């Protein structure tokens, strides 16, 4: 599964894009 | 929980944002 995360992706995930949610930028991680 | 969905949010979810991946925009649904 992929998640939108702040401040960064966690162990075992790589960032693939960006999410826009609650007026902020999130890393899209999978 | 929230998920990026295509083409839009599933029944009983609402669109609160966008997930951007390789030029594509997906619905961020909670």
DSSP structure string for B1-30: --EEESSSPPTT--EEEEEEETTEEEEEE-
Tokens of B22: 């390789």
Q: CB A20 to CB B22 under 8 A?
A: no
Query: Running DSSP on this structure, what letter comes out for residue A23?
Result: T
Residue A20 falls in which region: left (phi positive, over 0), alpha (psi -120 to 50) or beta: beta
Q: CB B18 to CB A19 under 8 A?
A: yes
Contact assessment for residue B27 and residue B6, using Cβ atoms and an 8 Å cutoff: yes
Residue B17's nearest CA partner among B7, A14, B2, A27 is B2
Beta A24-29 vs B15-21: how paired, if at all?
unpaired
Minimal-distance CA residue of chain B relative to A17:
B21
């Amino acid at each position: 599964d992929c998640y939108c995360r702040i401040p960064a992706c966690i162990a075992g995930e790589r960032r693939y894009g960006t999410c826009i949610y609650q007026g902020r930028l999130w890393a899209f991680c999978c």
